[PDB]
Amino acid sequence: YRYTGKLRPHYPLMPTRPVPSYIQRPDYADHPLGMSESEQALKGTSQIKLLSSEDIEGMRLVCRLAREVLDVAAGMIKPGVTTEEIDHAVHLACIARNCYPSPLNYYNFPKSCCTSVNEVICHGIPDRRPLQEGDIVNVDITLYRNGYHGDLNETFFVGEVDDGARKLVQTTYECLMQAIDAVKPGVRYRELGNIIQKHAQANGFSVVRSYCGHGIHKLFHTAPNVPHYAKNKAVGVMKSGHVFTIEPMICEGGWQDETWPDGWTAVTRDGKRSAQFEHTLLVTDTGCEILTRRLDSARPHFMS
Ligand SMILES: COc1ccc(N2CCN(c3nc(-c4ccccn4)nc4ccccc34)CC2)cc1
Ligand SMILES: [Co+2]
Ligand SMILES: [Co+2]
Ligand SMILES: [Co+2]
Ligand SMILES: [K+]
């Protein structure tokens, strides 16, 4: 394999971390290939669930707990800390909150969260590499509680970063927030990508095309599919009671991605840096509720 940038995987991975039997498990947790029966039974479906009142309460709880866990990871972002160490803290924090770490064994993903440094667009596997001053790093958290998944991510700075890293991370966050601001009943899902790309393009940045936002509730990933680029062909119209993510991945150079031989790690083909932010949203009558918001601070971690 020819690597696209400086980053390399740092093996071996510590042995898989068990989840105590008392924590409720998603269907794929024990599947040998980590396949989700409940997901696959709906593969190829455009129909979007309308959440019930109990569904909404279940989503509010898990998305609040997921935010608490992301905040734990944020606290550890410093030079010299390995991504595996982050993952260990995240694993324990999910368990402490009576939650299963959703990524763990999801289609055989080996860890409890995704840590995506510099040119990694997404799905970086936590490993022995110590974080380096100047790095940017996304940690993507999903928890599973009482049958429901809650999903968020943020990009962080490791120590002091250069001007381009600041510009990329700020713009990616702006893209997400501008898209969130457009969410309300009657809006087509395909529209968010127009908003996101317009802002990214205006700042000299490209938009990843291979990975999308997603419906989430009793399923980790389900309808709607939500592209982040312009003139996409997404199917569906927002309605009150829809729950989905917007999770734009934005790049310094081109939009093209490829995957490492591990089958997971998605990287820029040019080896330039990529950043991502994510919230789980509930469409309401006035617009939408940001289920994964911070409750005690106005801003994401990279600002404060
Ligand atoms: C035909 O059966 C399949 C169904 C789905 C998939 N996948 C794997 C799961 N998947 C997504 N996975 C992830 C992910 C996985 C592990 C850890 C963190 N994230 N993120 C996604 C985000 C958006 C859409 C899909 C996926 C969609 C494509 C493969 C085969
Ligand atoms: Co993912
Ligand atoms: Co997501
Ligand atoms: Co996520
Ligand atoms: K990254």
140 is in an annotated binding site: yes
Tallying the residues shown for the chain, one arrives at 304
* Rounded Cα gap, residues 132 and 10, in angstroms: 14
Establish how many alpha carbons lie within 13 A of residue 159's alpha carbon, considering only the half-sphere containing its beta carbon: 11
**Residue of 61, 37, 58 whose CA lies nearest to 222:** 37
Cα separation, 124 vs 137, in Å, equals: 10
Question: Whose CA is closest to atom 25 on ligand 1?
Answer: 221
Q: Which among 284, 303, 182, 195 has a CA at the least distance from the CA of 248?
A: 195
Q: Name the DSSP letter for residue 40.
A: H
How many whole angstroms from 217 Cα to the centroid of ligand 1? Answer: 15
Furthest-apart CA pair in the chain: how many Å? 50
Strand boundaries in 183-256, DSSP class E: 206-207, 213-215, 222-226, 243-246, 249-251
Instruction: Give the whole-angstrom CA distance, residue 179 versus residue 283.
Output: 13
User: For the chain, which residues make up each domain, given as ranges?
Assistant: 1-304
Query: CB of 268 within 8 A of CB of 254?
Result: yes
- Which residue reads 């569906």 in tokens? 236
Q: HEC states along 135-195?
A: CEEEEEEEEEECCEEEEEEEEEECCCCCHHHHHHHHHHHHHHHHHHHCCCCCCECHHHHHH
> Ligand 1 pocket: which of 35, 112, 210, 221 to mutate (most atoms <8 Å of CB)?
221
Ligand nearest to the CA of 111: 1
C-beta atoms surrounding 267 within 10 Å: 25
Residue 217 near residue 151 (C-beta atoms within 8 A): no
Which of 28, 27, 202, 64 is closest to 143 using CA atoms? 64
What the block records as the tokens of 197 is 């790309």
- Using CB atoms within 10 A of its CB, is residue 162 exposed (0-12), middle (13-18) or buried (19+)? exposed
CA atoms within 13 A on the CB side of 30: 7
Query: Hey, is 304 helix, strand or coil?
Result: coil
- Give the other-Cβ count within 10 Å of 53's Cβ: 8
Q: Whose CA is nearest to atom 18 of ligand 1?
A: 103
Q: Are 250 and 208 in contact (CB under 8 A)?
A: yes
**Closest residue by CA, ligand 1 atom 17:** 103
Question: Quick one: angle between helices 190-202 and 163-181, nearest 10?
Answer: 150
Sign of the C-alpha dihedral computed for residues 275, 222, 105 and 74 taken in this order: positive
In CATH terms, the superfamily for domain 1-304 is Creatinase/methionine aminopeptidase superfamily (3.90.230.10)
Enter the resolution in angstroms: 1.9
What letter would DSSP give residue 116?
E
Alpha helices in 210-262, H assignment, sequence order = none
**Is 123 known to sit in a ligand binding site?**
yes
Comparing CA positions, the residue from 274, 219, 272 lying closest to residue 245 is 219
H helix runs in the chain, sequence order: 37-40, 53-75, 83-96, 163-181, 190-202
Q: Which ligand is nearest to the CA of 281?
A: 3
Residues with CB under 6 A from ligand 1: 40, 43, 103, 106-107, 109, 114, 123, 211-212, 214, 221
Atom of ligand 1 nearest to the CA of 39: 4
Q: Whose CA is nearest to atom 12 of ligand 1?
A: 221
Method: X-ray
Do residues 34 and 106 lie in contact, with contact meaning Cβ atoms separated by under 8 Å?
yes
Which residue of 107, 142, 143, 245 sits with most ligand 1 atoms within 8 Å of its CB, as the best mutation to test the pocket?
A: 107
d(CA 266, CA 263) in angstroms, rounded, equals: 8
